[PDB]
Amino acid sequence: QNMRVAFMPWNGYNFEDSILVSERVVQEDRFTTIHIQELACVSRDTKLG
């Protein structure tokens, strides 16, 4: 997604390649992804039953 960036050092919170982000980005819920895990329970046939 395309967001409004400004190139400047902002009290060393973007010191190294790190990135500063505005709470508005989380408010608009625009970098929230859905992930999906699969889990499996297997019931086999043992000789005890």
């Binding site: 190139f7 400047m8 050092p9 060393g12 010191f15 790190s18 000789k47």
Partner: protein, 1344 residues
């Protein structure tokens, strides 16, 4: 746990194997796969190895703990704890005695040479193709004769009796049992006493050493052949049941099953008395199975079922990276550890780190439980667990309280040097990322672009003290490699500080006078003055001139507002001048440096934090950005490019006509393009650099611009001039795959757009760089691993050995100027003896004193040129080094402390740069004196001719430069035949051309004049006269020894120098008949009939980095070594043209018989009738350190290595202190070889330490008698590590099989004495905090 020491290794006897074993494993089955109970007598057997489940028999008759020694009557399984199933070993009784592959296939085949029979024969026997006649009675056959099938047949038919022969490993065992060790040893010694020939003497000495090892160690040779084979405890080779009725098994289970199968089938065949052929086949098969068990891979590589990968044998488990010592015994996987992504966290103090709440809770769980139980918040431990798993407010309060002073260790994946692990005090934060203090990133090489870090928790009280005292971030500000600071501000801080301190011609609040920095900030923050504007401010600086007292001087300085604002932070002791300048990267770094040297640690820490905060703040206030217009295309670029294109077009057209070759055109084009690139670069830098033409009150003026990209470049925050060029200029020339440079460069830049071709080319460049970094990284990691390995055991053990020895340290003046000054080269080394002022009896430095900054500056005030300093290599201490011989340099400032492991610090400091630099990468015609000085010639003997030249007749001639006050500024090496201008004494003006020479041509210089007379240069045999007319042109070719034709091989053409009358003019003072052997490629242009001038041209003659460092440290003969002289005296020639010309050095005093062969191609630099010194150069080329050590001695080779390595390292601009290279060199030459006799075996390679204690023992004895006299040896770090005393150290990283086999046969005993072994055994290292412990143990032995 017992308190032990001395790990002993030896051959296992069959009785010992029976001793370890609790039962025989007869059948290969393991488990019933139906009922998971194990086998009755199988790889997994309860009656042999132990009960599967704690304290309960298989059949279930006995289950109570009450029974502890009973063995159930139904199942013969004893009732004990299942843990024993991890230690109980089994055994297999082999029907046919089998050979142990390790003792056979190991490069020196010990079965082979022990029997003095080549390996080929052993192979013939083992694969059952041929026999060997063991004691074949009264016939015509010896005792180790290999016999083929039908030779055995005809022998047997002829000789029915007195013929005992057998086959296979059992035959070999028969040979081994019947051998008389001591008798053969004495016979062998007698043979050596009668035999004098090189190769046989070496093989013979090898055999006697093997025999001595057997008779001393107590191993009997027959034990190399296995009869009983032990089987590993089951839990060490598990057969785990995968979920789903399937099983997962180690490959050892497969190999053991195969061995048992072949053994049982061979047993059955023997019980059936099957024909010989089948039992022989079965014995062969059993051999393969067993040797696959022992070491799979020295045969047909028995692959596994349906997987094509070769399965892993026991030897594979030990040897190799993935297997063992490296993997599980030096590389464990700790508890109380975590990992996460690192983040900035600017607000942190230098000594702290942001740690996520949830990670902190998880790590410190048991601490939490303890504190919870102490306060009574939880009745029992399970309630504490439940309370932690709910995570109630009380839990977070307890976490805050326990975390308070508890420090954690932060580590970043490539722990290159010791600053890759540092301790911090954690501060609980939200989030899942670890927050890392910015200043320490440089130490970690950490970047916030997805780098992760691991966090360990020191548990014990001792660990806490070690982390907080020795390892904490604030205690490590100086790099252990060189003395310079590690925590220097990196990019935003330095950019902000630069912006703040730079001044501008005219701004708001120009030229107003301020009473102090405080109102400067009042003015700036209120917007009544620019952050940079020239102003007069009153400031009170403090200076500690007295004995630690601070004196305030308060005056008016002319500065900027910003510089005052910055001055607010600066601690008391520092002069104002420090901040008054532009304050870029270098300036800030040296600021921190001075703050450390003057004030000390704590003020430096606090000042660094302040620097970070102010830099970040004012960088943010600056608003520095990067727009497309911020990078200014030079206005005159297009003109420069069009001009260069016109020039290339003109040169190409003038080529197509054919007056210049292709190579000449190539060179010209490349040079003109390089010139155009430099021109455009300089124009762009002029445009961009000082472009702010802003106006003062009236007229205009010009100043260093405020272009954001320019400030980032100039400040040293990011980018160099080169990258600026690549942005705004033309991006220079490129290299094609093979290294050749494309004729047309890439004229476009990233501000503009490249096109497909230019992009593609730069793509090649980038790809090549990335591949290089990856390959280099692997090579460097190997090199540093070898380094840390070789030097691990070296520790500073003694305070002062008290030796007078030392190395003569000079400033390295390579050619043009002083690449490295004295002060850093000598800083922190103790002196070997007092150095005197330029006037005798004026001692400037007492006997050994540590040379700290003040002494070094004092030496700068005087004009001392060379200082003898104690070096680690010459240190006298036994089993380690002494503090004084080492010096001070550390992360702290003081003399080295007793106990410190200098080996590992040296190895790490020498290896980190090599890996780091690869990531970072991602003619000599005339001499030109640089500074006004006197010329001085060293090691020369000239004879002035009529033309007035100081003719150089010595190959080792040097031309140094003495300055006004007696100092050698410049130094050059002048070869034979170099035209000279000024002789000795003359004062040379600044930058005047004193010499001249042909770039691609070394002339041979005649000393006298007259006619050239041809002697033994007969026409047709070795030379072909093709001569031109009167003007004296010819093509007479005097070829060298190698290139001489087949007929003119022995006929040596010569040139006698005669005068106009005919008589050969003789060299002044000497009677020698001048017989000039024309050297290689002697083009005799000036034919007979032209009076030779002094200087006629006789013959025209037209690696670095990581591999070079690795080669120097491995001491690799560079395949074309230069040659040196052994003794002095008249050299002479000898028996001519055998295929390698003989040179016999004849000493005037010593014995003559030293002959050295020389290949034909070699040219000699010395005359026959010359006075050579020991170790002078005879041939040109790289010299192998071995020769330098042997002839010149220790200090010469160590100086050579140190300088040659330091050259490579400084070429890349990485500064390393010489002490580390010195420590490595000292570790290299740990060994000597004895030349005299008296207590040793007269030739054994033995470490110099034992030899020195042997000499001390002879001195202690009332009669010294023979003593021990020895010769030093220099070994490359791999071999040097291979010849270590401890066998665990050597097995830890090299071929495990070889060293293990050597130690097993030798019966070697390891007292551990070192670091890596002590690590492996899991006890305290003898270095640092644990040194005392080991010292205590030293007192514990041989005491009451």
């Amino acid at each position: 746990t017992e308190e032990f020491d001395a790990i002993k290794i030896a051959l296992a006897s069959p009785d010992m194997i029976r001793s370890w074993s609790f039962g025989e494993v007869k059948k290969p089955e393991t488990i019933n796969y139906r009922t998971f109970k194990p086998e009755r007598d199988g790889l997994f057997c309860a009656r042999i190895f132990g009960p599967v489940k704690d304290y309960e028999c298989l059949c279930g008759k006995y289950k109570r703990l009450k029974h502890r020694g009973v063995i159930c009557e139904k199942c013969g399984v004893e009732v004990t704890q299942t843990k024993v199933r991890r230690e109980r070993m089994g055994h297999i009784e082999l029907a046919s005695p089998t050979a142990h592959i390790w003792f056979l296939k190991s490069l020196p085949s010990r079965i082979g040479l022990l029997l003095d029979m080549p390996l080929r024969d052993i192979e013939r026997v083992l694969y059952f193709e041929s026999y060997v006649v063991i004691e074949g009675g009264m016939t015509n056959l010896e005792r180790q004769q290999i016999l083929t099938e039908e030779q055995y047949l005809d022998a047997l038919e002829e000789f029915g009796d007195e013929f005992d022969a057998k086959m296979g490993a059992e035959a070999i065992q028969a040979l081994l049992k019947s051998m008389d060790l001591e008798q053969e040893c004495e016979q062998l010694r007698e043979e050596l006493n009668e035999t004098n020939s090189e190769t046989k003497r070496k093989k013979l000495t090898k055999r006697i050493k093997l025999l001595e090892a057997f008779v001393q160690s107590g191993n009997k040779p027959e034990w190399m052949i296995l009869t009983v084979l032990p089987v590993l405890p089951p839990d060490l080779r598990p057969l785990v049941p995968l979920d789903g009725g399937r099983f997962a098994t180690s490959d050892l289970n497969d190999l053991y099953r195969r061995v048992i199968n072949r053994n049982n089938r061979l047993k059955r065949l023997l019980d059936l008395a099957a024909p010989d052929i089948i039992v022989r086949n079965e014995k062969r098969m059993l051999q393969e199975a067993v040797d696959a068990l022992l070491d799979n891979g020295r045969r047909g590589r028995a692959i596994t079922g349906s997987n094509k990968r070769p399965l892993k044998s026991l030897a594979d488990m030990i040897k190799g990276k993935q297997g063992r010592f490296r993997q599980n015994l030096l590389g464990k996987r700790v508890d109380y550890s975590g990992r996460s992504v690192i983040t900035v966290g600017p607000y942190l103090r230098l000594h702290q780190c942001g740690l996520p709440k949830k990670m902190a809770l998880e790590l410190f769980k048991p601490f939490i439980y303890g504190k919870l139980e102490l306060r009574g918040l939880a009745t029992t431990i399970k309630a504490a667990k439940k309370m932690v798993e709910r995570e109630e407010a009380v839990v977070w309060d307890i976490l805050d309280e326990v975390i308070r002073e508890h420090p954690v260790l932060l580590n970043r994946a490539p722990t290159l040097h010791r600053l890759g692990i540092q301790a911090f005090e954690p501060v609980l934060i939200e989030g899942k990322a670890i927050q890392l203090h910015p200043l320490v990133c440089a130490a970690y090489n950490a970047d916030f672009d997805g780098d992760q870090m691991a966090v360990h928790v020191p548990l014990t009280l001792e660990a806490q003290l070690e982390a907080r005292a020795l390892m904490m971030s604030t205690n490590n500000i100086l790099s252990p490699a060189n003395g310079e600071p590690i925590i220097v501000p990196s990019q935003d801080v330095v950019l902000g500080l630069y912006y703040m301190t730079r001044d501008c011609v005219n701004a708001k609040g120009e030229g107003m006078v301020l009473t102090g920095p405080k109102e400067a900030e009042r003015l700036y923050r209120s917007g009544l003055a620019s952050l940079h504007a020239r102003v007069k401010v009153r400031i009170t600086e403090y200076e500690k001139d007295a004995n630690g007292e601070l004196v305030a001087k308060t005056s008016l300085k002319d500065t900027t507002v910003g510089r005052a604002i910055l001055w607010m932070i600066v601690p008391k002791g520092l002069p104002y001048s420090i901040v008054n300048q532009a304050l870029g990267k270098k300036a800030i770094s040296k600021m921190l440096n001075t703050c450390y040297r003057i004030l000390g640690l704590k003020p430096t820490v606090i000042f660094a934090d302040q620097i970070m905060y102010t830099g970040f703040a004012y960088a943010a206030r600056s608003g520095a950005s990067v727009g497309i217009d911020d990078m200014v295309i030079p206005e005159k670029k297009h003109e420069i490019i069009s001009e260069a294109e016109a020039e290339v077009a003109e040169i190409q057209e003038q080529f197509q006509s054919g007056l210049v070759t292709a190579g000449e055109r190539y060179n010209k084009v490349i040079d003109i393009w390089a010139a155009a690139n430099d021109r455009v670069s300089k124009a762009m830098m002029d445009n961009l650099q000082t472009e702010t033409v802003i106006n003062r009150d009236g007229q205009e003026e010009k100043q260093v611009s405020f272009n954001s990209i320019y400030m980032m470049a100039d400040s040293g925050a990011r980018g160099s001039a080169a990258q600026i060029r690549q942005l705004a200029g033309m991006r220079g020339l490129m290299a094609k795959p093979d290294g050749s440079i494309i004729e047309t460069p890439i004229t476009a830049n990233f501000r503009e757009g490249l096109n497909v071709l230019q992009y593609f080319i730069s793509t090649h460049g980038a790809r090549k760089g990335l591949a290089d970094t990856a390959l280099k990284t692997a090579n460097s990691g190997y090199l540093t691993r070898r380094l840390v390995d070789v030097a691990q055991d070296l520790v500073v053990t003694e305070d002062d050995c008290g030796t007078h020895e030392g190395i003569m340290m000079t400033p390295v003046i390579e050619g043009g100027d002083v690449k490295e000054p004295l002060r850093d080269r000598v800083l922190g080394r103790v002196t070997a003896e007092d150095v005197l002022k330029p006037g005798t009896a004026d001692i400037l430095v007492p006997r050994n004193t540590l040379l700290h900054e003040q002494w070094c500056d004092l030496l700068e005030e005087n004009s001392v040129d060379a200082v003898k300093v104690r070096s680690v290599v010459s240190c006298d201490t036994d089993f380690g080094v002494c503090a004084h011989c080492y010096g001070r340099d550390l992360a702290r400032g003081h003399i080295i402390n007793k106990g410190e492991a200098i080996g590992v610090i040296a190895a790490q400091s020498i290896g980190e740069p090599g890996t780091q630099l690869t990531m970072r990468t991602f003619a000599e015609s005339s001499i030109q004196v640089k500074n006004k000085g006197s010329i001085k010639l060293s090691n020369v003997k000239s004879v002035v001719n009529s033309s007035g030249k100081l003719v150089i007749t010595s190959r080792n001639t040097e031309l140094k430069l003495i300055d006004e006050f007696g100092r050698t500024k410049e130094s050059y090496k002048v070869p034979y035949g170099a035209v000279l201008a000024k002789g000795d004494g003359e004062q040379v003006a600044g930058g005047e051309t004193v010499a001249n020479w042909d770039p691609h041509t070394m002339p041979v210089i005649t000393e006298v004049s007259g006619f050239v007379r041809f002697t033994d240069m007969i026409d047709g045999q070795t030379i072909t006269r093709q001569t031109d007319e009167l003007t004296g042109l010819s093509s007479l070719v005097v070829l060298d020894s190698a290139e001489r034709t087949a007929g003119g091989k022995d006929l040596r053409p010569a040139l006698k120098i005669v005068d106009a009358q005919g008589n050969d003019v003789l060299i002044p003072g000497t009677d020698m008949p001048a017989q000039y052997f024309l050297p290689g490629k002697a083009i005799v242009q000036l034919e007979d009939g032209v009076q030779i001038s002094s200087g006629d041209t006789l013959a025209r003659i037209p690696t670095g980095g990581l591999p070079r460092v690795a080669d120097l440290f491995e001491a690799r003969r560079p395949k074309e070594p230069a040659i040196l002289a052994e003794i002095s005296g008249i050299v002479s020639f000898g028996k001519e043209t055998k295929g390698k010309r003989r040179l016999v050095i004849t000493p005037v005093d010593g014995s003559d018989p030293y002959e050295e062969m020389i290949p034909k191609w070699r040219q000699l630099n010395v005359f026959e009738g010359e006075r050579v010194e020991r170790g002078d150069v005879i041939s040109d080329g790289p010299e192998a350190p071995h020769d330098i050590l042997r002839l010149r001695g220790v200090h010469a080779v160590t100086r050579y290595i140190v300088n040659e390595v330091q050259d490579v390292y400084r070429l890349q601009g990485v500064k390393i202190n010489d002490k580390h290279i010195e420590v490595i060199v000292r570790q290299m030459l740990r060994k000597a070889t004895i030349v005299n006799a008296g207590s040793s075996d007269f030739l054994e390679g033995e470490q110099v330490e034992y030899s020195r204690v042997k000499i001390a023992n002879r001195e202690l004895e009332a009669n010294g008698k023979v003593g021990a006299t020895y010769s030093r040896d220099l070994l490359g770090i791999t071999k040097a590590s291979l010849a270590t005393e401890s066998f665990i150290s050597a097995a830890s990283f090299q071929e495990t099989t070889r060293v293990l086999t050597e130690a097993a046969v030798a019966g070697k005993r390891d007292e551990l004495r070192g670091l890596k072994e002590n690590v492996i055994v899991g006890r305290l290292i003898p270095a640092g905090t644990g040194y005392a412990y080991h010292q205590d143990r030293m007192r514990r032995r041989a005491a009451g």
